[PDB]
Design a protein around this ligand. Structure first.
Ligand SMILES: Cc1cc2nc3c(=O)[nH]c(=O)nc-3n(C[C@H](O)[C@H](O)[C@H](O)COP(=O)(O)OP(=O)(O)OC[C@H]3O[C@@H](n4cnc5c(N)ncnc54)[C@H](O)[C@@H]3O)c2cc1C
Ligand SMILES: *N(O)c1cc(C(=O)N[C@H](C)c2ccccc2)cc(C(F)(F)F)c1
Length: 418
């Protein structure tokens, strides 16, 4: 029934071997969880989606991994309630294509659509529109969770099961297997964006642009960010901001099918873009690259500037940098986003990199920030627990729901969440 398999995250690092169950039969999945539970836990089980997480959260060395990608049925779409009811293995590209004709838009879109609904929930993913829409968790109306007791719990965000529900959002699969979920989509009349572009010349100017009050005028906003230039050109950014377009905003040619599927000069106004236009590690790493993401609380703006400073001075040079100001956070104890300054950098693997990122960890930690489980397989339990003050609250919920540790992963063991 299972296939022993070498697994890594997307950046192809920290491999381990697991027995992979890959079946479209939900009953086989229930059986397998039950079997692990009846062996008393053993080395446990974790779910896997499309493997786009860079870390070790979707692998389980010496244990069971359940590939959820064959559970990919879209059960219902409702344009009045805006609700879609889909299997957890459904991916966002497939969902985008299916929902567009109903005038529905996937409410949170990350940098790639090759992620499953299960993975979107388990990592509580965020997008270019976080400051207006929150993260993926905010839009989950209900979900079916297969728990350690072999039963499938129906969870809602305010029901009796609220606590389990919000430990599951951002829970990295460690409360059980999300089988199915109901997501509230965003209404739209077109599949296009209308975007305003701006360029800055300094880190301070980037920050002022995000603090002047104009962010509140766009539903989506992110920026490419210079991390190699010494000050004051350090932290200059190419900012892409916008909102979904109405039909009467489209070029006349595109009005026939508005819901169709698919420095210096970079200043513009009312440019009309499809998703691809508006929006290396796997190809070259991990002989090549270490991806690194963190968020610093809004009020700690100067501490943020300094970390940026430390990065440019490091001698570790990242071209691919993405910056964004996160909005308010949600109820999930282990959710990554907090309101604040968020950035992803991609470092070439070079001598002294490990020691340098350990120093970064310390700084993000002291300044009240955190790393993202979706981008990590290197940090320590001590660092992670410190970055997530609600971790003991979350661990308690997990103990109530999985007393025998039927659910387990490489990440759970490394970060002592098991
Ligand atoms: C090119 C690229 C761009 C990205 N951009 C963004 C971005 O803009 N914003 C962002 O937040 N993230 C981004 N990510 C990270 C990615 O969106 C998340 O890691 C996401 O969780 C991956 O989904 P997946 O289905 O591939 O999950 P996997 O990587 O397979 O698994 C991730 C976690 O989800 C759990 N999981 C998966 N399915 C289930 C299930 N059915 N039940 C319970 N748990 C489950 C796994 O156990 C694991 O803990 C990006 C990744 C890549 C490679
Ligand atoms: N980080 O603040 C951040 C990263 C992305 C993102 O899509 N990153 C992936 C790995 C990527 C980077 C560069 C080139 C290709 C892919 C997205 C955001 C968001 F805030 F959601 F816009 C933030």
């Amino acid at each position: 029934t299972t296939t022993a398999t070498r697994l890594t995250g997307w950046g192809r690092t920290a491999p381990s071997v697991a027995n992979v169950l890959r079946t479209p039969d939900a009953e086989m999945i229930v059986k397998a969880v039950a079997r692990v539970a009846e062996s008393g836990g053993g080395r446990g089980a974790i779910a896997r989606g499309l493997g786009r997480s860079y870390g070790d959260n979707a692998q389980n060395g010496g244990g069971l991994v359940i590939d959820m990608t064959p559970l990919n049925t879209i059960h219902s779409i409702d344009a009045d309630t805006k609700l879609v009811d889909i299997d957890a293995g459904v991916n966002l590209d497939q969902l985008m294509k299916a929902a567009l004709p109903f005038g529905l838009w996937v409410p949170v879109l990350p940098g790639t659509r090759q992620v499953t609904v299960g993975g979107a929930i388990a990592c509580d993913i965020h997008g270019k529109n976080h400051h207006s829409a929150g993260s993926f968790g905010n839009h989950v109306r209900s979900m079916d969770l297969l728990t350690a007791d072999g039963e499938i719990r129906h969870l809602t965000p305010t029901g009796e099961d609220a606590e389990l529900f919000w430990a599951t959002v951002g829970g990295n699969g460690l409360t059980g297997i999300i089988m199915r979920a109901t997501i509230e989509m965003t209404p739209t009349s077109t599949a296009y964006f209308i975007a305003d572009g701006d360029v800055t010349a300094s880190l301070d100017e980037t920050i002022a642009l995000h603090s002047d009050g104009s962010e509140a005028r766009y539903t989506y906003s992110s920026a490419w960010f210079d991390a190699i230039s010494a000050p004051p050109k350090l932290g200059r950014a190419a900012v892409s901001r916008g909102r979904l377009a109405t039909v009467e905003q489209l070029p006349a040619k595109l009005r026939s099918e508005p819901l169709k599927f698919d420095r210096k000069s970079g200043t513009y106004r009312g440019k009309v873009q499809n998703l691809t236009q508006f929006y290396w590690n796997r190809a070259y790493g991990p002989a090549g690259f270490l991806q690194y993401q963190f968020v610093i609380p809004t009020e700690a703006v100067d501490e943020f500037k300094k970390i940026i400073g430390v990065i440019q001075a490091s001698g570790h040079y990242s071209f691919l940098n993405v910056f964004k100001l996160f909005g308010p956070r949600n109820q999930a104890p282990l959710s990554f986003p907090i309101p604040g300054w968020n950035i992803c950098v991609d470092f070439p693997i070079k001598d002294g990199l490990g020691k340098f990122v350990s120093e970064l960890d310390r700084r993000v930690l002291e300044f009240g920030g955190r790393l993202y489980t979706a981008k990590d397989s290197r940090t320590t339990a001590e660092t992670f627990h410190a970055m997530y003050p609600r971790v003991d609250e979350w661990i308690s919920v997990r103990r109530k729901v999985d007393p025998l540790r039927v659910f387990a992963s490489d990440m759970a063991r490394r970060l002592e969440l098991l």
